[PDB]
C-alpha cells in the first residue's frame, strides 16, 4: 500500500473506473532493502516490485468503511457483498476448496 | 469475382436466413453455396536470445508492447545488414528501440537507457548515429519538448490543481517556442525550465533540485535559463505580475551573435586561388631534398654527450621492454615444449 515517506493512505484507481478499462485492480508491493554498494553498505526504502490484485471490502481498498457518500461518489452499490477480484475487466472470485 | 450469366463484378452475401450464400446483384444467380468455414537455427537462436533482451528493458521503462514488437524489425534488418558485428550486445539493442520510441513521439529521453548500465550518454549515443547513417533512415520525428512537460507532472507529486499549472506551462512554452533559445540547445533543458517557471508562481515546489531528479540536468545550467529569458524582451513586464494574456513576438535575439558582436552575380571561377600552382612552386625532386635547406633544422640534432644521458632516463622509465623481453623468451620455451 502506502509509502513510508508521505505516510498518506494512498492514491488509487476507483474499482468501477477500473472495471470499465479492462485493468487489474491492484496495489503496489513495497519493501526496504539493505545491501553493499561498494566501499560502504547502504540501506534503501520503498522499493517497488509489483502490483497485488486485492479483493473488495478488504481493509486495503478504498471501499472499506464507506458511508454511501464516498461510495456515492465512487458509484458502487452499498448492497454489494464484496470478496472478488477485477483482473483485467471481468470480475472473478476464488472458490472455497476442501480435501481429505 | 465474375458472374456466369451477367458477368457481375459485385457480390452480396445474404445473412437474413443464415444461408450465407453469395449472389450477384444484377440478375440474382447464386455464385457459391454451402460455405466452408475454418473452425539458420543459430540465426534463430541468437534472435530468440535477443527477443528476451529488448523485452527486458521494456519492462523497466514501462514500454507498451507495440513499441517493442515494432523495434524488433529494426533489429531484424540491422542483423541482416551486418551492423550487429563488432559492437556490444546491449549497445546494439538500446540504440535500436529508441528509434521506435522516436517514431511514436514518446516522453522517453535517451539518457535513461544509459542509466542502469553505468555508461555515459554519448557512449551509446556514438552507436546511434552510426545506425541511422548506415541504414539510411531519412524520415525522423523532431525531438519535440512539448511532450516532456505533460509527463513531468505525474512524478512531480504536486498539488491536485495540476492541470492549470500545465496549461500555464504550455502557454509559457508556446510563447517561448516563438522565442529564440532552443535551436541548438537541449529539449530536456528548456522543457526543464519552463515547467520550473510555471510552478514557481503558484507554489514553492521549486527547490532547484526536485526537478533535477526529474529533468536530469545540472542545477546551474537551468539557472542560466532563468537569466536568459530575462534580458531579451517583456520578461520584466511579467517578472512580478501581468497575467498570461499577452500576444507579442518582440525582437529576434538568439544568444549567439551577441557574444560574436561583443567580441568585436555569383562568384566567378577564375578569381579564387588554385591548387596546382601551389603544387608546382618547388621542384618534385624524388630523392634529392637539398632545396629546402636552412640553419635551424640543420642544428635540430642530438646533444652528443647527452646521447647516453637522455637514454639513461629513457631506460630508467623502461618497464615495458623489461616485461616485453620474457614474452619473446617464453615464446622460445613454448615452441620447444
Amino acid at each position: 500500500g502506502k509509502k513510508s515517506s508521505s505516510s498518506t493512505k494512498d492514491y488509487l484507481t476507483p474499482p468501477h473506473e477500473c472495471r470499465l478499462r479492462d485493468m487489474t485492480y491492484s496495489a503496489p508491493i513495497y519493501v526496504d532493502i539493505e545491501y553493499t554498494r561498494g566501499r560502504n553498505i547502504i540501506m534503501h526504502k520503498d522499493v517497488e516490485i509489483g502490483r497485488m490484485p486485492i479483493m473488495l471490502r478488504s481493509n486495503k481498498c478504498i471501499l472499506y468503511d464507506a458511508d454511501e457518500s464516498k461510495m456515492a461518489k465512487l458509484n458502487e452499490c452499498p448492497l454489494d457483498p464484496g470478496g472478488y477480484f477485477i483482473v483485467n475487466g471481468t470480475e472473478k472470485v476464488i472458490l472455497v476448496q476442501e480435501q481429505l | 469475382p465474375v458472374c456466369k450469366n451477367c458477368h457481375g463484378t459485385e457480390f452480396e452475401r445474404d445473412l437474413s436466413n443464415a444461408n450465407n450464400d453469395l449472389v450477384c446483384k444484377a440478375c440474382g444467380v447464386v455464385s457459391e453455396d454451402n460455405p466452408i468455414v475454418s473452425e539458420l537455427e543459430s540465426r534463430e537462436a541468437t534472435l530468440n536470445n535477443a527477443r528476451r533482451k529488448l523485452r527486458a528493458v521494456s519492462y523497466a521503462l514501462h514500454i507498451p508492447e507495440y513499441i517493442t514488437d515494432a523495434a524488433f524489425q529494426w533489429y531484424k534488418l540491422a542483423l541482416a545488414n551486418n551492423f550487429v558485428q563488432g559492437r556490444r550486445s546491449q549497445n546494439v539493442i538500446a540504440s535500436c528501440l529508441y528509434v521506435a520510441c522516436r517514431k511514436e513521439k514518446t516522453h522517453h529521453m535517451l539518457i535513461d537507457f544509459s542509466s542502469r548500465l553505468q555508461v555515459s550518454v554519448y557512449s551509446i549515443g556514438a552507436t546511434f548515429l552510426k545506425m541511422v547513417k548506415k541504414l539510411h533512415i531519412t524520415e525522423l520525428p523532431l525531438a519535440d519538448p512539448s511532450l516532456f512537460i505533460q509527463h513531468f507532472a505525474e512524478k512531480l507529486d504536486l498539488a491536485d490543481k495540476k492541470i492549470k499549472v500545465v496549461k500555464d506551462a504550455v502557454k509559457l512554452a508556446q510563447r517561448m517556442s516563438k522565442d529564440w533559445m532552443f535551436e541548438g540547445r537541449r529539449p530536456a533543458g528548456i522543457a526543464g525550465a519552463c515547467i520550473l517557471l510555471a510552478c514557481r508562481m503558484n507554489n514553492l515546489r521549486r527547490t532547484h533540485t526536485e526537478i533535477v531528479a526529474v529533468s536530469h540536468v545540472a542545477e546551474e545550467t537551468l539557472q542560466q535559463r532563468l537569466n536568459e529569458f530575462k534580458n531579451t524582451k517583456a520578461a520584466k513586464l511579467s517578472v512580478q505580475k501581468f497575467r498570461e494574456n499577452d500576444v507579442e513576438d518582440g525582437e529576434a535575439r538568439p544568444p549567439s551573435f551577441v557574444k560574436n558582436r561583443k567580441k568585436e552575380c555569383p562568384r566567378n571561377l577564375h578569381l579564387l586561388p588554385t591548387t596546382d600552382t601551389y603544387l608546382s612552386k618547388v621542384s618534385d625532386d624524388p630523392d634529392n631534398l637539398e632545396d629546402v635547406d636552412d640553419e635551424e633544422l640543420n642544428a635540430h640534432l642530438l646533444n652528443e654527450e647527452a646521447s647516453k644521458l637522455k637514454e639513461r632516463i629513457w631506460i630508467g622509465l623502461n618497464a615495458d621492454f623489461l616485461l616485453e623481453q620474457e614474452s619473446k623468451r617464453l615464446k622460445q620455451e613454448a615452441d620447444i615444449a
Binding site: 470499465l20 478499462r21 487489474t24 | 445473412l15 437474413s16 507495440y66 524489425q73 534488418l77 511514436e104
Partner: protein
Amino acid sequence: HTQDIIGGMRVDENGDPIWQHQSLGPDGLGEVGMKVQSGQIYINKSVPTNSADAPNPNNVNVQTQYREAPVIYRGPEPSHIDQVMMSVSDNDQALIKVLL
C-alpha cells in the same frame, strides 16, 4: 506505426445514409438513442491492409490502404443503442464499448 480509423457514412445520391448507415453517426460511432436492425453497421472499423509488412523507412505511397472490416448487428429483433463510451487501456491503446 499504423492505427485503425473510424471513417464512416459513405454517401449516395445527395444523401449520407445508406440502408446500412442510418444509425452510424458522424464520427463512425453509432449514434446514441436510435434503433438498429439487421444489417445497419453500428461501429465502422477500418483496418490497414499491410498488417504484417516490414517497415520500409520511408513515406512514398501511404494514402489508400484501409480496407473495411465492420461489425454487423445480427439478431431477429430491433434493439436500441443505450450509450457508448470510449477510453484507454493500461497501455496507450483505445477502446470502443457500446452497450445495446
